[model samples]
Target: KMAFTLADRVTEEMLADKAALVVEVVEENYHDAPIVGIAVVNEHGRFFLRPETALADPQFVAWLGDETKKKSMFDSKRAAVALKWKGIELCGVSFDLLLAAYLLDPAQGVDDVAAAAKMKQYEAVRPDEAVYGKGAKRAVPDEPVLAEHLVRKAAAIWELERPFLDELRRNEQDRLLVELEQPLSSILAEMEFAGVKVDTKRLEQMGKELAEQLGTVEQRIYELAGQEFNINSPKQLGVILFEKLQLPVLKKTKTGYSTSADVLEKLAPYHEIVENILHYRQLGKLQSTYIEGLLKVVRPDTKKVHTIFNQALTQTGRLSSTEPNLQNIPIRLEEGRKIRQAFVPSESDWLIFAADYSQIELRVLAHIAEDDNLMEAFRRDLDIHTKTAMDIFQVSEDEVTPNMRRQAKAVNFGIVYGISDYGLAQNLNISRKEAAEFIERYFESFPGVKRYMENIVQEAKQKGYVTTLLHRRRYLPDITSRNFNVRSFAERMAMNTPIQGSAADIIKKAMIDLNARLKEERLQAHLLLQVHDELILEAPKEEMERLCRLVPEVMEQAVTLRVPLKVDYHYGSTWYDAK
Candidate 1:
């Protein structure tokens, strides 16, 4: 039985303010269903849910043949909505939920309240919608039983959120509330809103071309082997590499011979077949991951890719993309770059521009650890990795090879990720001992960084949360989690959140300011994409020149560092053309 009206009064503006919490109730797939009852609670501790009903299952239907029952539940959620009318204050409540979780355990990937409930067992209850979503096809339970379950579940969400809300209050995280958390929420929501323009026609065209290119290469490779095989199948390719061809094996994998791109590159000297296989691999991946994959996801109405920015998913505060991952959209290859070319500006009236932080993670290390040498290097606008190479090998810039900088860059990022000697060795193509020595020298050069990292871990252990320079907290519950896998990984996250999460805080604030300033000046442009180190914008043809200058300036000044924030800007008609 349904009763009363289920009214939703959220406008785009109000939607922007309480963005995250609003999603919890409104974003669920089951929102359109009928309501059997109602629940309402307020700041003053007054609340009620549907008590008396003749319906077989009140939770099973939010919208039903009976009008009265539907009114009850609709009124309840709307009441929760009224309290939130003034807004939850966090730009994205999910952001705060995650930040709190990361402080509790950096490595844990708890994306929603439901996952947290499962992990916390006694703390989670089934919500009204979940009951409905689950019961839609099944026999309905008794009205009172279903009502109690839904009420308790909603209460659990409120209860679990209360302490975290208190943490936000107690930490007096207000300073961060403005400078950090609020802006982060804004950036994520904006990115989701802005969405990426897709050139599906071009993507489809590229797919055909790539398939042909891959076909040509596979034909050549098949001729060389004197047979035809499934070029895309790793098992089949392995047989060609190790069995028929008798190519030297670089490594062994569980499946068979490891035909890694790097390994195949090494084999390039041995046979023309290796080169052809490499081309096949590259072309196939481009077609499948970028071209064909993009074709499948282009939203029917917008012809754009609306990637989900999973804010609370990563321990380091790095955003993950799914259903056509924007992050892994093949940016390093010619074919991959061609895939980028398909992401054109949505309108002829606009253009795309991108700005990236120059060596941001390194700069953050300098700031967080208060390393005078690192800070001085940044202040002077010197090449940081180059300086690092010069110091480590005791060489001049002329003697510092590109290989050295590349290795140094990897190490710079690796230490922030809690890289082990073994992990560093694999990453650098060096021995474990060598990786360890290099890491030791790095710490020795900037002892302050070492101290800062150590202090972070100790603090996490002491208080069970890691914090950014801005005091944005990431709770590490996994440190005390019963599961060994969770506990061990949580230990690593405990060390990382400050370094990585703080870096995220820095970049997001930059984006929010840049977005506002662009609007304030009434610029005819918009932001498009953000890789970890870079921000991209699309502008009108007439405004491109000014935006190029304005964007870098806005980003460079977004947050002041001991060292200047250097921005490397590149532009093209499409996202792919940007260097």
Candidate 2:
């Protein structure tokens, strides 16, 4: 069966005209046997069917084979390869029906296709769970029954498309969906298909080394505790640390004493076991998540890991990867950093080229807020945290001590995150009063930023949503919530989303443009992965000079703003070396 959407071409007048055309096409094409099932959704929505006897028609098959004649659908790979009989290139498709529904109302969290259709006011669709049954009781229905279910879903998508389009237009998201998100779906599909090569041997070696290190750390922890216990079990660790050893309880939870990482870190200086446990946890995570987990997902023949990017999942419009989440490959720890070594070039002479924006979010913040001092700091290429330290602590460049710079950095990120004084204090391990003072001083240093923060929250309260530079909207329904914490969170989201979302948008637009440029120029380099502000690509050694010149230029020019964008790049045989 096939699913198609006309979201890219919805119009008010098409209600009658499009309906007649669809009827005419179906009748003229299938006069004898007739189309098995047809759904004229949303007046301009898509359709899905078995094709079956319709495949026998040379005209129908030819229409399907013609890439130029194909309308926008959901899957880029499927669109790119139209007919099995002949080679055709048609990589134009719109956002998935499910994705469009999710974007329309994120808080609703609609995952089921039937539920998405319902949200779009198409009540004819039934939940897949209901039709298929739940868990082990599930059984596939006979063809006739299954065909009916599938056609109903296709009809649902068809019925929902027009309404979804109207919603998109009303929300001022028409261009965002059409121009940005639709194109991105294709690009992300291409990237996913390209798949990153994995050095399985390297991953295995690291796993072996990590296993030994983890055992050593675990043994040391057991020795410090004066007895053996399950380090992985939080309840056991809690008893060992708090009750038996009589250590100061930094925090508590519903599960008894909290032996969580944060609590453990706070007690690290007090006991040797705490330090050992932290190290043990770190090593164990690296071994399990990065090494063993990655090994499971790598294709046996190709030795590559292809992660699926969830385009419509995040609230800030950021993409998330799963099925061995490459995005979450730990980087803060040395052991975690080594995981990158496994991400090597696909070919012998090819190399991994990685480029990341430097202080991009802060630069976005400066641009959005039009904060002169912050912009000036970036303009002069000064160490932003040190500059923040000098401004907030009233210290000269030479006098900005490491601790002060560290504190300033905390404050700087805190502001970006819309962190409360309590949150800031928790992050910096300082008193709330001290964090408050630091925040106040920061605002004084950059009054424009303060005004912008205050103004954005008020704007969100007035408008009921926040938007990125590219007009990606995030509705803030809780900005006027009765509860202080709920309202405060909404306020923070309002301030933070634009800064983060705009940064995400900038990188995404860069990916789309860069993908097109690479295709247009017919370059050998393949865009491999997008990790937050970074982009990874693999190319032959011969393409290095052009890639070096093109990657940064395309990224910087992706979007223009008050401050110029900056990108730092490096290339090596492996992703670790590229770093």
Candidate 3:
């Protein structure tokens, strides 16, 4: 039997006016049989004969339609071919339909069926699976052995899912534009309005200086290897760092030596060569990624960096940007700050205004856990980490040494990341047991946070999904995972996503509100960059003073939770030089 049955009839008059319908017919099923199925899928589901007559012998007609049809409806059985209408229809063909089919069974690991399903869904009815399971992949077993496989599977599915991502925006234009597009677009536009200052010439010149410094480091790398090789090449670098230099192997990567920046930075203190390479990498990144990259991305006509906000990628409501990825710009390093000097005021008459949240994540935890001490500290604007150190160590506030505060800060943020003893050890340079003790003390100090963690994880396990305050959902298909590691990892993520995602939601709302306020107030300052909790803006030199004072007030009050939010401000001619 043919893949699709032939329709009973089409009058010459009925099709003459709609030549586009022929194109639709062939496009609907032009592949499998060197043809596709087509029929009038209107109220009658009839293509030809009188509807009442057509219904007289339904089974006989169905059998005749299927059994008598050629593999291709266009293959022609008779010499009575009409010159004008002999070919197949191609009107309704859509690459999107095929993509839609692939989405229908994303996890099925079946491409061919997906293709046919694509044709069928568009040609006639949209299957329920197509709408709900668009690009959904099959459930992967939660096991240690399959962990890599799961990552690979998720990655591969994402790769395939990439092409069709835009199709949804295109096809579901009404729903997306009406429901989601405006808020995201408006928020990002407002963020851009909150532009930060740049010290263009200083940043440019400092970037050049870093390049010169890196040249020296590169020369030393060659000398250590006793030969020049591509410093950027993993294989070449591995050969030099591990084989030629005979450095003891700390770890093995998928390829060879673990010359990753993390490993190299750790190894730096042990060997001068490693230290130099680490310096070289840092300087190289500064020059390449931050300085040159930013310059390349800056709009020449606007003399501004326009970071495109991607709304669809994350299940969480966080906005990510790229084309120099302003979010990923160097901030921690003093040298990295030098690059910000390039982001000077658009005109000498303008000044860049910058502000960032102080302990936003900790405050978010406070809000989520409703911990009295943490909330009290926020209400009083006390130093949270110092307070945490005092609480954890059971000491006087003055007894909270910088080191203790540092440890306290690390553990506080670390807990937000679903801390394990191993992760804590790696972070604090402490032994596993020491990390464990620190974590235990942390829980003891804030028993509410401990309870919150347990409750959140349990809720996720029962629900098979995690959601932020905005109802953004990430379905954990393996919430009941059999593998201990996989289940635990999901459990931790369950603990983290709501809080992290809620914070993301809060910030996004703040950006939107701040933008609206700026517009309503008729402010000239424009938001330029968002580095997590930090937001940067470019304002008229005259307005910079006012904005510096006003912006922080806006941010601090952006979300009126039980705890008061604190914001810190920094102003400079350029972003890097800003405090």
The model with the greatest lDDT is: 2
Model 1 agreement with the true structure over 125-183: per-residue lDDT tens digits: 55444554532454335655554554454444545555655655678674464356444
- The true-versus-predicted C-alpha distance at residue 236 of model 3, in Å, is 2.6
Report the C-alpha lDDT of model 2 over 352-436, residue by residue, as the tens digit: 9999999889999999999999989988989999999999999999999999998898888898899689989999988999989
Question: Compared with the true structure, what per-residue lDDT tens digits does model 3 show for residues 183-217?
Answer: 43544544443333444566677876887898889
Off by over 4 Å in 2: 1-67, 70-90, 133-140
Arrange candidates by lDDT, descending: 2, 1, 3
Q: What is the descending TM-score order?
A: 2, 1, 3
Instruction: Report the poorest 10 consecutive residues by lDDT, candidate 1.
Output: 14-23
Identify the superior model by lDDT, candidate 1 or candidate 3. 1
TM-score of each: 0.75, 0.88, 0.68
Q: Residue 395 of model 3: what lDDT?
A: 97
Model 3 C-alpha lDDT versus the unseen true structure: 0.58
Local accuracy by lDDT, each model? 0.63, 0.75, 0.58
